[model samples]
Target: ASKGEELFTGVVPILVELDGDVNGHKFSVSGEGEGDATYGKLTLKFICTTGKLPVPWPTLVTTLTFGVQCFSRYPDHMKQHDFFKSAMPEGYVQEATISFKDDGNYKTRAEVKFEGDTLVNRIELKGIDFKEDGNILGHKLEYNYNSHNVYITADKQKNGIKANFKIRHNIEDGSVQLADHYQQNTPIGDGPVLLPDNHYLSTQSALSKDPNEKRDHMVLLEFVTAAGITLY
Candidate 1:
């Protein structure tokens, strides 16, 4: 039988152990609702027997984005005689892998890259018909690689879509600092009505000024130190 036909119908379901219920991994860094999605998205699905890594650590963070399709021409095909999937798409944008080193410093790093393919692969003919560029491509995000201070930054230049964000968690405990330039390539807040910074307008947390303000971090300083602290 031809290779495609064999892969399409011959394999026993177990061979596809680590298959997600979806078509494939979209190796992009799509931030959560509050995050700047224009940066990109990276969603992964893990499937296995032991339910833990077998020593190969880096690849899991590097290549798992290339998913092993379910036992069908289309991984997302409808259920079969007795088919049931287990794996679910997980691994959000900018995940931190904390590992204690010999010197006693934590080694935290996870490279985020997005490769939107599943839909293209569903047709059964990939590489030839799949166009990687011209769409959601050329997205780059660096999450705290400098080692000393941790930070999250994203800059994406795509067809008609441009977005970026710079966040430094080192905003002095419970105080908030504005984006260096008080501006973002992407929009934040509900939607059309956004919180785009102008010039050098930053944030000042009520927690920073008052030690008894009941705070742990400066992430939500704007709201924590708001005049009325509206939550609508």
Candidate 2:
């Protein structure tokens, strides 16, 4: 309801397709719907969120799509929104179908990403009968389980740069330090660039400092960006 916004008053059936491999098993899946409970019984909402300025809708939508596709394949390492039971490797044989009507009471969202010219989609659901495959198509779309407590976010900045992050701490009775770095990459000429493996952040005692009590197992790498705009 903030950045990407579009209202739906009556019944609006939005269908989405799915594709990718689950646990090394390559397959294709497509399911779509708003919901069915008379006409006015089901409320509808659709929106997109991005930090890039000047409204880069194409790039924003594509980035979101690719992220969703990756989440569907690797449920073990992702914890964002649960729009559908998206652990598409095996176990589900039926076609996946989900909609706004399924998880209206809690939280639900669909994010898409475009990579290599492919549009990938993912819906956040709360629960699923099958954790392996067809949860994407199961009748129930309650996909609300968070795989991890710590979450990081990245957003836009000035001078055509990106700077933003979000983290969900699940520590017991202590604190942790999270540092990020990135490789070095400078543009040269019009068709070349120097991309070096400059990983890991600037080491510091504060980055490795711990709290007075207990601490949880956490690790952070070079979470830095590559290149950006010019300033002379």
Candidate 3:
């Protein structure tokens, strides 16, 4: 493949790992990228295998479903995916490394430099099998902003599947915080509505202590439908 502009220079690969045992198959991944103006065209290469045999191309198709997510720091306008969603300041990119485990599991860790002035909001997932009749079950995700971390758990059940997640935002230092955790039974198609009608200015005033605190807040108005597919 032809290489694109060098967007990540002097950046390190964010590392992640997943663990599980489904059908005597195990997989892991590691890679790096630069979070800069040239982030959109970035691609990740994986060196994966099953029981000492190279994972077939068809299996690779399933593996590509995993990806890292990015969004605006502020909630309302920047939350939902749209033509403008991918438009970050001038230079903004979050990088990470993901690993898939044996028993049909996975994990990811991202190293983000939230420029003192920039707000870094993103998510990542690895090793997901959406193949028909696949041994995969379900999955879960969680975010802990107080600790600046995110967690996801995928469960392979006998009859069904589940994806669970937890997200906590650190709101102590004027940083925006998510009030209630958002959950979707299945991946959404059109994307999430960041600017829900319930989160309007009047509604915010009614819940405020002074009803006129004039505090600045952000609302993420977008949602992720498919694992890596983002829609405005």
Candidate 4:
């Protein structure tokens, strides 16, 4: 059978496993998806195998449009499968790997690079270790979750590139006040001020003022590099 015909009539495997904490409760979720080319449809089914929450969290079964007729084509046929990639910037490709433990802890690392020019140049994430606590929709927090580095390189000449790093806690509608240890960066919450002698170097936030605010608290560490700086 041709590659297109095989893809249109094949059973695509969709094995997935998830173990994490939600609102101070531990939970495990596992599931798979089945594709039916003859019916031009896909069925995603999953169940919450174990959790401390009182809710039954019944198994979920949902149907998705696969468009078998379109599947036999090339680029247009890939639309449904590119749901997550559609949100990314053009000419950008990302590689990520994650490992989950039986104790509800996970170790994840990722590398994001550009095959062509874009707003971002490169990004490296590592040691994403943390424990979440509090109730869902109420408050959830983890300390020092930003041990990653991002390199920004805009396309225009005036848009210079820089490295932004962070070393602090982050929260969402946190039950308690932001950690004092995590709040030591600055009034606007920048970091160590790496380029002390540089003229145009300063920590900037996308928000109006500081990265920290009501319902969410974050302080990003940013600094511009000199002509001799290198990321490798």
Scored by CA lDDT, what does every candidate get? 0.19, 0.22, 0.25, 0.25
Model 2, position 176, has a per-residue lDDT of: 24
* Residue lDDT tens for model 1, 29-121: 211111111111222222333333222222122122122221112111212210101111111122222221111111112222112211111
Misplaced by over 4 Å in model 4 are 1-9, 36-40, 52-232
User: Candidate 2's residue-wise lDDT over 1-232, tens digit each?
Assistant: 1010012222334334433332233333243224221221211121322111211111122212222211221122122221111222110111122221211111223444332233234544222222232222222222111121111122112101111222122122343212121111111123211121211111111112124413221111111111121123
Better of 2 and 3 by TM-score: 3
The list of candidate 1 runs beyond 4 A from truth reads 1-37, 50-52, 66-232
Candidate 2 local Cα displacement, residue 168, angstroms: 15
> Per-residue lDDT for 103 in model 4?
12
Please, what's the RMSD in Å of model 3? 20.8
Residue 182 displacement (Å), model 1: 39
- State the lDDT of candidate 3 residue by residue for 89-181, as single tens digits: 222222222223222333332222233333232333344443323223221211121221222222112111122332232332444323222
Worst 10 residues of 3 by lDDT: 199-208
Tell me which of candidates 2 and 4 scores higher on lDDT.
Answer: 4
Q: Report RMSD (Å) for each prediction in the order shown.
A: 20.6, 20.4, 20.8, 18.8
Record all residue pairs in model 1 with backbone atoms less than 3 Å apart, i.e. clashing: 27-113, 27-114, 28-41, 28-42, 28-114, 29-40, 29-41, 29-42, 30-40, 30-41
Question: Could you give candidate 4's per-residue lDDT for residues 69-143 as a string of tens digits?
Answer: 111112332233221122222212232222212112222212221123211222222223333432212234332
Q: TM-score per candidate, in order?
A: 0.16, 0.22, 0.27, 0.25
lDDT of 3: 0.25
Off by over 4 Å in 3: 1-12, 20-22, 34-39, 49-54, 57-65, 71-232
